[PDB]
Design a protein around this nucleic acid. Structure first.
Lengths: 397, 919, 400
DNA sequence: TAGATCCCGCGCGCCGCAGAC
RNA sequence: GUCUGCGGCGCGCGGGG
């Protein structure tokens, strides 16, 4: 259960040594390592391709990090410790931004941005009621400790569909999200969804992951029948009405928002495996389509050299071929190959390629796979093709 | 009233001759078994003025209705029977549509066959969809042919209404149609998919053959093979195996029919049809001619076998069944197949991950001590410097020039070298089968998926060494059933499961997933879930071929009546279609409707992907399904027949007493109330009981008990004769078999071995393949089953004729009887739905009363005089309030909740003027 | 002038009501960009990451917090929009009622949490982690692209701009060489995606923090606009970040531990995208932008043919394009059918590399009309070969 | 009970083919 | 003058309904 050791050893977790689970979940953690950043970027790209590139009638949505609109006191427990926190009984030597209208606000979700951009999306489209707005970005939320501002990466997709099929569209979106969570996951059973009802009676689905501590919500879907959209732009309804069919009606917006950082943490937890196995092997069996480092080039005994430039050339060729290769032939003095393989696997290294003294003539280099602890011999040629094929297999299925 | 509970009627004279001796016998019988003294709850009395009966009795009333319904179809049948047929024309026409062949084969185009009777055959091209390609028909006048218009080369892309044939006039008399497997041709006749009814009825020589010297399923095998086991074979010369050629051979002595060797319809292309048009048309006409021969030899014999007009009227009505689908059948198929694919891929991924994790025992030789994969061979067969970016084209072309020995060494199993043999067998080649990284091409069907998961019990190799899953699998060579395992295999012992291939077995593994000593175990995450996947997947895996590829013909807007249109629920880009079940009206030794997919016992069950098949049979808007399942139909029929044999009172035999008075809760009921306490559990005691009224014995009961759970033969029905002793105490001597217990089965036994028609209600004769008079034989079990199941068929026939009479006497816009395992549904207009309930109740009143009128019972109990609930719905589900597994819920589709009525429907009458609501 | 209106009409830019003037687009106060602009910005960011991260060998990704929190921030020193109260954003607090503090006792000198206008502070903070990531490699560096907020002047609004900041650590002796190499790489990047590389220019500046620094400018039609700034900051900032740290901040170059020299290069991604769009724009209003950065690559349309067949062909083409990773504009499903010329003009205004039209002839034989906006030439191409031709064109554009 | 054996997959042997080493 | 794996042709056994 001491998975934090692996996160600290590899550049996949935050820099701070003390990173509580609650702090990481709330987004108040110091950050994430380069491997974590790469994994988050890959997950975001996959989600965008599935929802934006794959789904038709869906367009990107951009929301400002902070809302300069006057609005009113927001979801802040303390109103800048000004209205409720007055220095002394009076100390009237004076709002100092006490009025919310006086200054901007820190956006917590893209729902306001989606509502604002709904009119623009409808105008751009050919009056079609079915429309989509996606936005992936960092949202800041207040976390109270017995206060702080925690930034978490979240992806929000809002689909405006006719009210008649609003429930069907919401169900389809929930099913698609559940399938996506199951895909690229070692144990899709862990990720599930649960029906929930809002305070006003709005129904929706919330996605949860069964972490070892317990079930934690990682996504939430809410369907609004032109309530928030009408509130944002209540002056006129003709311009806010979409043409689902022969007549124009007020669209219903189903917004699904998922915490990208929470999703990455859940995926990392799922990668690790747990009794009666009788074979302990610390390995992060992350999906190849999302693994940070796909190919790890290495060096032989070091007695003959020629491996550093080989690794550099392999990395350059992979970059020209769209494959990311970590040039591991520069570092030396390891004195052991088992430790290097274990580190690469813990770094989510799909394959490890080693060049020996027999690499010049009869270039059969050694290949090691994280999934199977068995050695292979592969020709120097077509290695990039093999990596590309493996990546394509991971991405497609 | 009363006398242990009876109803008050409208029909009937004085009568009232119970008999003091009969009452004394019944009372002293009810003293034992159940308790004679039960106050019971008197049900509310119902005052109902029945519609005016005809004749002097109920039997004559039923005989008059059925004659009125069967007169013109019998006239058309006799018109065909007394007809002479000219020779076949020399050359068939090529024109589309219908072509009539007058004298000397003069071909003239005609719109439709303007004949009161026909013998019809249709051929379909399996490769090019399911649209028909050519049909041949005959009447007393001449010959007719039809070409399907697909012989031209144009694109049609399915989903049409003029694709099928045309056989009904514009009606501006009764249009009998005769055929072999005439349901299949009815699926293509057209004017049968219309929701508005039509007067054409169909006579299937398959149905008549099953009635007239049909064959059982255990007898079909013995007939095919001969194209304790000692049997008489005098039934071979009267019985066939239901094939057109064979039926023609049996009923007609002549040259055998020739078949098309190339089989251009089942395995061929439309071009082959165009080249061999004349030969295929000749074959179709030969089939029609043999059908006419068979019909001529069948119809008078048919009417001899089933003299009652009611049987013929019921067969005519049951040949027109209708299943609306309404735009969600395709959606149900699509979501079902998508879920199937997703679950299959998830299970495959879990299996590949298990295989990958199974490689860690190679790193430490630890496979030998592993109880799972010990027997596997597990042999490890092999099977600075500048980047220099140049000569890329030469390197690429070297691979293409590497044909011969350069590519011979790698071949298929080269990737991942040095791995154990089994893992390499799972791994495909690099080039041909793509790469599919990992041990792909792995499924449950392989012998290696066991020992990668499951292995419950003690030792579960699942190796097909003439024994499949080997194991004693119970307490007490060495390590045969030991928990550590790793058997020496010194000598095979097939202990524990000693039945081997003798037992019929079944998919008892699917319900054994829940406990039953069948789970993965140490896996924790991916092991058990694969078994969960199999449990959820097996049904659709097995049945997606049948449920998919169902013939759905979507009616256009012009083909719908004014009721479906101008309704709150309409359009929404909606497709209102229909499925004719292709159901043979008589498809068994008993004349039961037989359909492999629609007429089976299935319902929307959680953890089953392919379930809610019965759902999505949704009535068109403005119409609804009014239907009911008879409350223990076969149980009550056996009880009443047994009660009539013992005395004149209904509850005399103590088995009809329990069927009448016993209740599910706070009541001695055989189903889910008692027979679980002496037995094991409910929903298995139901199956236990339904097997005895259909005929069974200690062997079948013991095997059923063994299937229920893991119990030895002593705890099974070998030492346990108590179920046999306390129920079905037949074959008792020194009594100058009859009863001697709750159940009176000797009436069925005396019915079977009597050589008479043997049907107590309608007098439908048994098949000549089973008659003792035709052949002395020991197929008694099938005949005992036949009596009750054909009495059930006769109950259905009576219900059908009564419902038709009530719908025609009173203008109730309903039709299209669908019968499913003793349940009957009628697609009726909403405005009359309550009447259709009342009529149905009245039908259940008359039908039971008819069942009462025969066997000598002039009164009927109040409890069974009416249906417990009349299900009025917009869908076909077992209960009015149910759900499904694949969708979120029924309200994901436009499915509301119905109502089961009860005695509320009794606040009306059957005339159009009910409570003044009309007009 | 007309370029902004054309972009807004084709959904390239956001609403012109708030960003009518070019100043808003140049600064971070602009109200975002349109879907075409968003796609172009994403493509440019991906290309920059590949050139800086993929091309680099010892460079690893570095993540920096959006806002730097704590009372540690100096009193009124580089404190812009320093609220950290989850509400309000005061860019300038020059005149305030100093009763207890500038604004409040709790909200002044303690709660800053001001979003950094550059990633240099984040790079300095994460240099400790990056050294371990690069195995104490003195020539290592860290690059990251993110949104930076700056104050723009009554009330001082906060303008957000997407900028890419790269901190390269090199030995002080070779620090000048590293700066020159970075300048050459920046020139190469400017000439890679610019129709006229002469428009991009570089200037040399001197400052106390950095003796030699390079500033990149683009010759926009309005005038020269700064798009990149390079500062060769010394080890003083590292010493300030780490007080009394010995052998920790210093990197190992040539087996010798010495204080690394960190050069920070910051480039405005939005400014570069705007400059590229302006360069592309120039009788027909067509923006000849680079295909790699073009928001729209291939557009599929259906006309003059069966409705069902055309829809099926369009769906198949879109699925094939998605499977290959090339975005396809959903031209189908539009029943307006105003005109072929109007569709071509819209595609040109949408930065569509090529226009694909499928008609009854395509259904009959599989050949569809392909038109090139840059060449204005229309030909017939096979549906199967269309993807191969697009891939070949993309490869040629990438490697020219 | 009605309870099934045409299509549909698991295995084996058997005979014929390239071809360097 | 071989034996490593691939293309049609026989056998056995359950399994759906």
């Amino acid at each position: 259960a001491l998975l934090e050791i692996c996160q600290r050893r590899h550049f996949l977790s935050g820099s701070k040594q003390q990173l509580s689970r609650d702090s990481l979940l709330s987004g108040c953690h110091p950050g994430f390592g380069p491997l974590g950043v790469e994994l988050r970027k890959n997950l975001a790209a996959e989600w965008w391709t599935s929802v934006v590139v794959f789904r038709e009638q869906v367009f990107p949505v951009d929301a400002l990090h902070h809302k300069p609109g006057p609005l009113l006191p927001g979801d802040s427990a303390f109103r800048l410790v000004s209205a409720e926190t007055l220095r002394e009984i009076l100390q009237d030597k004076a709002f100092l931004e006490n009025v919310l209208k006086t200054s901007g606000k820190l956006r917590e979700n893209l729902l306001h941005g989606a509502l604002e951009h709904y009119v623009n999306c409808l105008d751009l489209v050919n009056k079609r009621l079915p429309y989509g707005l996606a936005q992936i970005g960092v949202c800041f939320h207040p976390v109270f400790d017995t206060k702080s501002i925690g930034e978490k990466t979240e992806a929000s997709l809002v689909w405006f569909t006719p009210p008649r099929t609003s429930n069907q569209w919401l169900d389809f979106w929930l099913r698609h999200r559940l399938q996506w969570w199951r895909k690229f996951a070692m144990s899709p059973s862990n990720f599930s969804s649960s029906d929930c009802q809002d305070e006003e009676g709005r129904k929706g689905n919330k996605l949860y992951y069964n972490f070892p501590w317990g079930k934690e919500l990682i996504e939430t879907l809410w369907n609004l029948g032109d309530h928030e959209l009408l509130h944002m732009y209540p002056g006129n309804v003709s311009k806010l009405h979409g043409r689902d069919g022969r007549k124009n009606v007020v669209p219903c917006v189903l917004s699904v928002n998922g915490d990208l950082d929470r999703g990455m943490l859940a995926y990392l937890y799922d990668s690790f495996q747990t009794r009666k196995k009788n074979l302990h092997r610390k390995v992060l069996k992350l999906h190849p389509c999302l693994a940070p480092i796909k190919v790890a080039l290495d060096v032989g005994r070091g007695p003959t050299l020629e491996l550093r430039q080989v690794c550099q050339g392999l990395f350059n060729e992979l970059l020209e071929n769209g494959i990311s290769v970590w040039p591991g032939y520069l570092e030396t003095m390891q004195s052991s190959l088992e430790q290097l393989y274990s580190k690469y696997d813990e770094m989510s290294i799909l394959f490890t390629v080693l060049v020996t003294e027999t690499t010049l003539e009869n270039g059969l280099i050694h290949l090691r796979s994280r999934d199977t602890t068995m050695k292979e011999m592969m020709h120097i040629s077509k290695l990039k093709d093999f990596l590309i094929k493996y990546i394509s297999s991971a991405k497609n299925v | 009233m009363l006398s242990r509970g009876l109803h008050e009627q409208i029909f009937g004279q004085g009568g009232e001759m119970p008999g003091e001796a009969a009452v004394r016998r019944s009372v002293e019988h009810l003293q034992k078994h159940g308790l004679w003294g039960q106050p019971a709850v008197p049900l509310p009395d119902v005052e109902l003025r029945l519609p005016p009966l005809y004749g002097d009795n109920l039997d004559q009333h039923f005989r008059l209705l059925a004659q009125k319904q069967s007169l013109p179809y019998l006239e058309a049948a006799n018109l065909l029977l007394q007809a002479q047929l000219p020779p076949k024309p020399p050359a068939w026409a090529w024109a589309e549509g219908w072509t009539r062949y007058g004298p000397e084969g003069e071909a003239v185009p005609v719109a439709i066959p303007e004949e009161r009777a026909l013998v019809f055959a249709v051929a379909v091209c399996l490769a090019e969809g399911t649209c028909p390609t050519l049909a041949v028909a005959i009447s007393p006048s001449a010959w007719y042919s039809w070409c399907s218009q697909r012989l031209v080369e144009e694109r049609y892309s399915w989903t049409s209404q003029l694709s099928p044939a045309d056989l009904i006039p514009l009606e501006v008399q009764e249009q009998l149609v005769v055929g072999h497997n005439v349901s299949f041709d009815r699926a293509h006749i057209r004017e049968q998919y219309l929701i508005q009814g039509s007067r054409m009825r169909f006579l299937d020589t398959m149905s008549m053959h099953m009635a007239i010297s049909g064959l059982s399923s255990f007898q079909r095998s013995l007939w095919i093979a001969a194209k304790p086991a000692i049997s008489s074979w005098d039934w071979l010369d009267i019985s066939s195996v239901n094939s057109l050629a064979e039926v023609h051979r049996l009923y007609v002595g002549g040259p055998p029919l020739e078949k098309e060797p190339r089989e251009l319809f089942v395995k061929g292309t439309m071009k082959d049809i165009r080249e061999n048009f004349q030969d295929l048309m000749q074959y179709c006409a030969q089939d029609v001619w043999a059908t006419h021969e068979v019909f001529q030899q069948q119809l008078p014999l048919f009417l001899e076998r089933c003299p009652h007009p009611v049987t013929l009227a019921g067969m005519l009505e049951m040949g027109v069944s209708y299943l609306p689908v309404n735009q969600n059948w395709e959606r149900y198929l699509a979501e079902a197949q998508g879920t199937y694919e997703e679950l299959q891929r998830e299970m495959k991924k879990s299996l590949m991950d298990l295989a990958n994790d199974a490689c860690q025992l190679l790193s430490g030789e630890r496979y030998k001590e592993d109880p799972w994969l010990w027997d596997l061979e597990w042999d490890l067969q092999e099977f600075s410097e500048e980047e220099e970016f140049q000569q890329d084209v030469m390197a690429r072309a070297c691979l293409q020039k590497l044909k011969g020995t350069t590519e011979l060494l790698p071949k298929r199993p080269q990737h991942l070298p040095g791995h154990p043999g089994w893992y390499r067998k799972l791994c495909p080649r690099l080039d041909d089968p793509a790469w599919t990284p990992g041990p792909s091409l792995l499924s449950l069907q392989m012998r290696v998926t066991p020992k990668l998961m499951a292995l419950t019990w003690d030792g579960f190799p699942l190796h097909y060494s003439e024994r499949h899953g080997w194991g004693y699998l119970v307490p007490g060579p060495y390590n045969d059933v030991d928990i550590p395992g790793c058997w020496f295999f010194k000598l095979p012992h097939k202990d524990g499961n000693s039945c081997n291939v003798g037992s019929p077995f079944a998919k008892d593994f699917l319900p054994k997933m829940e406990d039953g000593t069948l789970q993965a175990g140490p896996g924790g995450a991916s092991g058990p879930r694969a078994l969960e996947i199999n449990k959820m997947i097996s049904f659709w895996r097995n049945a997606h071929k049948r449920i998919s590829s169902q013939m759905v013909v979507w009616l256009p807007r012009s083909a719908l009546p004014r009721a479906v249109i101008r309704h709150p629920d309409y359009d929404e880009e909606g497709l209102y279609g229909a499925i004719l079940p292709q159901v043979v009206t008589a498809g068994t030794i008993t004349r039961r409707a037989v359909e492999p997919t629609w007429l089976t016992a299935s319902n929307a069950r959680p953890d089953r992907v392919g379930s809610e098949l019965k759902a999505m049979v949704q009535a068109p808007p403005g119409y609804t399904l009014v239907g009911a399942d008879v409350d223990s139909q076969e149980l009550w029929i056996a009880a009443v027949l047994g009660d009539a044999h013992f005395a004149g009172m209904h509850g005399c035999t103590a088995f009809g007493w329990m069927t009448l008075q016993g209740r599910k809760s706070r009541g001695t009921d055989l189903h889910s109330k008692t027979a679980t306490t002496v037995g094991i559990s409910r929903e298995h005691a139901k199956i236990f009981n339904y097997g005895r009224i259909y005929g069974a014995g200690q062997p079948f009961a013991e095997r059923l008990l063994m299937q229920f759970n893991h119990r030895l033969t002593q705890q099974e029905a070998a030492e346990k004769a108590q179920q046999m002793y306390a129920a079905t105490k037949g074959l008792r001597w020194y009594r100058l078999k009859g009863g001697t217990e709750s159940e009176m089965f000797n009436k069925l036994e005396s019915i079977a071995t009597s050589d008479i028609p043997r049907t107590p209600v309608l007098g439908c004769c048994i098949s000549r393949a089973l008659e003792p008079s035709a052949v002395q034989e020991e197929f008694m079990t099938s005949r005992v089953n036949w009596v009750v199941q054909s009495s059930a068929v006769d109950y259905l026939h009576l219900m059908l004729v009564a419902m038709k009479w009530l719908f025609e006497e009173f203008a109730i816009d309903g039709r299209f009887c669908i019968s499913i395992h003793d349940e009957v549904r009628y697609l009726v207009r909403e405005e009359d739905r309550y009447r259709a309930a009342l009529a149905l109740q009245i039908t259940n009143l008359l039908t039971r009363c008819m069942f009462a009128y025969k066997l000598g019972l002039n009164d009927l109990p109040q409890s069974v005089a009416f249906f417990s609930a009349v299900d009025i719905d917009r869908c076909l589900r077992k209960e009015v309030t149910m759900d499904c597994k694949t969708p979120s819920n029924p309200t994901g589709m436009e499915r509301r909740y119905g109502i089961p009525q009860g005695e509320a429907l009794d606040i009306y009458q059957i005339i159009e003027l009910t409570k003044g609501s009309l007009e």
